[PDB]
Design a protein around this ligand. Structure first.
Ligand code: NA
Ligand code: NA
Lengths: 483, 483
DNA sequence: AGAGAACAACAACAAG
DNA sequence: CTTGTTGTTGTTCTCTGGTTCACGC
DNA sequence: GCGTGAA
DNA sequence: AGAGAACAACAACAAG
DNA sequence: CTTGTTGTTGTTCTCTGGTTCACGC
DNA sequence: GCGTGAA
């Protein structure tokens, strides 16, 4: 038990042999700190203890080709294993997924990613189900649904009606899922609000463009090195990138005026009304908070959609101290928040917010349809629960929730609040933690593309479609079912 | 001694624990096969044997930060060590270096790379001396020479007159080395011949451009997937890339006509006189042989410069069976080979070729200056050799070489031929293997940039200038002084 | 050339 | 014999040859 | 002073 | 958000 | 006390949100 | 049939 430490002169040879691994095999300094790398050294000291210090390393060490073939083998294994645990969630309603498409930068295979999302031991599960190519079929709806089913047939899922799907409004995607539950990613919606709002306020184009021309010049003249925080990409459309550049420009205002002065290029910054820039950055600062809040799948996010909208109605509260150009932006942004964000919300966004214990808010109209909604879902739990055998009624259990009060203490976790409430509310708290499992966005699947890209790289470019789907699910699995 | 193998059920857990390293820590399948990775497992089985199977892995395993600090520490160590072995070569004449500049794709620091080249135990040493930033000084000659000296002062080299330098004709570089021995990279020269030759034969622009428009369309329409050998980049100037595209296009002729036919885009290939394309590819095929021959620093290359030129005079031998457009190219190419390649050769390229045992060739004029050259260098050996103490004369030893004959057997290694000849020729064979050490090009330093780029990557982007210079020299060192 | 990666396609070989 | 599991070959894909110095008229 | 050349 | 990387700048701590 | 060697913090940099489907007039 | 929208 008591893991013995090693002599000082011994460990001087660990950092002597590790720093040789990294220079000879061109590997990252932080490979040594990897949760998988350590367990693989546990195994090699054990074997050393067993067979002594004169073992056939070559022979005993596997071959990359077989390592390739084992991940391919172990892939199917771990898929079958949870083939049951997954199958549970989809049956017992509370399973949500997010899908989107993505295309790699070397072969350019169209890819479809799927994740899955459910609640368990007072914790959330963001698991990467599949990432399969369409080889090169047209990205048509029916081909997508074709490959959607194939991911779920891997774990023996097949009704996929009880599944709540969360995607962007990509026309081809939207149609694929017209047969089942589909929730609109609120990050694309929010991004749509910004995009359309700033398009609709071209009074602000003059400041912005000039900023972009600053960044563009700093990149071209090889002088981002004199900044303590280099200036960011203009508008290659990374969600809220317009705030991003503006801040990095503002956060380096003094150094920039100085650098441009030395260049004699002072001409191209003086026309920038900084007063406005600043004002934009404060207004969008509130927004960036909502972006990160809604990219969370390790804590309930769906429920935070409605109150975010109110914060935006408030950042954009009309104020008689504003220059007309900002007045226009706030005017426009409240307009889009209505016709774009509100317009594409559903009773999954309200009900998720209803199950927030400060339930005082949505007192108006919405409870009459939420009650209609809430009742019919708890009824489908029982339906599928009676199939599992082979006073205190819900319509009142509802209003017993509506009478309670709570405070919003900074340590409050409404996810834990329902695990610690299932006794009095046995069948409603199973509905709640089912909705708190739904992610407010498809950012999960977005990270899968980030991850996928982390694998299929310059040197690793020969990598196969199956190798990638395996390696992803595995990594994802060894995170949801291991410590 | 007899390294014992492990049980079958034990190794099933090696490939069970290795395939977990690779999915959890997103690492290449071929990390398991790395010459540095194995020696680092040798150490961990040994320690397991010693302290048993219940060791504190965490505590004993180093920290990335320290791993960073050890490579930085061990860097200076290994630099001082060979501080002597290096210092030898530069003193004893037979040291050659290659330098060039390069700028990384994330910080864009101007970089200066240096390698060193000498002969020893019948083998060649391509060693990466330095890769240091100019931070952000102008890439001016005197700044370059400033940083040139700083690399050589690391190993306590300081006269750097006896050093033979090999670089491209970059104006700023060329001047830095105007004080010492500087040989023109024959790959840039050869590349200059192609470039200027094809510029000077615009009759061939019509076929070529149409090919480039083929590639450009295959990339844009996502249909390189139906090729068994995708079509290559048009003209982003990778040395002989014009042959490269042409071959990949030709090597997929039938599939391309078919793919374009399906697209209805048959219009954009039919005007390509394939007859010519083919002819270009045969002519440039000979050339690509010379490119790879001259990028070699693990075998003498300098000596193969002159005879290559003759092969080109021969690939381009005038032939009455040629369409005028190819006649023009060969006409132009013999013209540039003279005024570009020949024009920038020196008696280091002839003398290196003289020390090829089929010495019958260069019988004309050149021996009268080579004898003038050859004598004065063997005289400087003695000069520095007499300082090392603190009949059969050279002018005849010369012509004793000129009388011999040899055959060009396919297994002949003229590098080994001089190690097996030093007895009769004690002071001339030291001159020979000094010149056979000089690389015909700066391709060595080019690979260093390839290597450098392999380190400073997307995720590893924070990497420091010192970290990179270290990691390079180390990797380079553990290859020239280890088995 | 030099490096880094991955497979297809075998060939070997083994279990059944 | 058929399966299934390996190991080895060879084939394919990357990547650095890159934009501002120095000079002469 | 500006074009040319080579990277 | 989630992931991967690296340091500067400390703080700890130790040797001398 | 001064050195030198560590370990820990926090700050900075990456990266996926991406171009062709589906629809309606 | 072609524009518009959303990616
Ligand atoms: Na998409
Ligand atoms: Na260069």
């Amino acid at each position: 038990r008591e893991l013995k430490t090693v002599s000082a002169d011994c460990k001087k040879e660990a950092i002597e042999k590790c720093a040789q691994w990294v220079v000879r095999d061109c590997r990252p300094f932080s490979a040594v700190s990897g949760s998988g790398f350590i367990d693989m050294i546990k195994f090699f000291i054990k074997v050393g203890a067993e067979y002594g210090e004169h073992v056939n390393v070559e022979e005993l060490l596997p071959s990359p080709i077989t390592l390739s073939r084992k991940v391919t083998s172990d892939a199917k294994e771990k898929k079958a294993l949870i083939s049951r645990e997954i199958k549970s969630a989809v049956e017992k309603d509370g399973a949500s997924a997010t899908i989107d498409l993505w295309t790699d930068n070397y072969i350019k295979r169209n890819f479809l990613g799927v994740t899955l999302h459910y609640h368990e031991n007072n914790e959330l599960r963001d698991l990467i189900l599949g990432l399969k190519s369409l080889d090169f079929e047209r990205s048509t709806a029916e081909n997508i649904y074709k490959k959607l089913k194939a991911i779920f047939s891997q774990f023996n899922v097949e009704d996929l009606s009880s599944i709540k799907f969360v995607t962007d409004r990509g026309a081809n995607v939207v149609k694929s899922l017209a047969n089942n539950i589909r929730i609109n990613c609120s990050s694309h919606l929010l991004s749509n609000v910004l995009e359309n709002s700033f398009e609709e306020t071209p009074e602000l184009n003059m400041p912005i463009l000039a900023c972009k021309n600053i960044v563009k010049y700093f990149k071209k003249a090889n002088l981002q090195h004199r900044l303590r925080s280099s200036l960011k990409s203009e508008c290659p459309t990374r969600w809220n990138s317009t705030y991003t550049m503006l801040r990095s420009i503002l956060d380096n205002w003094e150094s920039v005026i100085q650098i441009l002065s030395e260049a004699g290029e002072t001409q191209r910054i003086v026309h920038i009304n900084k007063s406005i820039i600043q004002t934009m950055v404060n207004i969008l600062d509130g927004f960036e908070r909502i972006f990160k809040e809604l990219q969370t799948c390790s804590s309930p996010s769906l429920c935070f959609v409605v109150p975010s909208i109110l914060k935006v109605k408030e950042i954009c509260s009309p104020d008689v101290g504003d220059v007309a150009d900002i007045a226009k932006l706030k005017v426009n942004i409240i307009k889009n928040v209505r016709i774009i964000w509100e317009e594409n919300l559903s009773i999954w966004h309200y009900t998720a917010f209803f199950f927030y214990p400060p339930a005082l808010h949505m007192q108006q109209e919405k409870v009459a349809q939420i009650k209609e909604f809430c009742l019919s879902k708890m009824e489908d739990l029982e339906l599928i629960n009676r199939m599992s055998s082979f006073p205190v009624s819900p319509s009142d259990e509802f209003e017993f929730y509506r009478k309670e009060i709570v405070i919003l203490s900074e340590d409050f976790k409404v996810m834990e609040w329902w695990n610690l409430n299932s006794k009095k509310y046995p069948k409603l708290s199973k509905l709640a933690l089912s909705l708190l499992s739904i992610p407010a966005s498809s950012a999960a699947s977005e990270r899968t593309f980030s991850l996928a890209g982390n694998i299929i790289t310059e040197k690793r470019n020969r990598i196969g479609q199956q190798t990638v789907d395996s390696l992803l699910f595995l990594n994802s699995f060894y995170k949801n079912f291991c410590k």
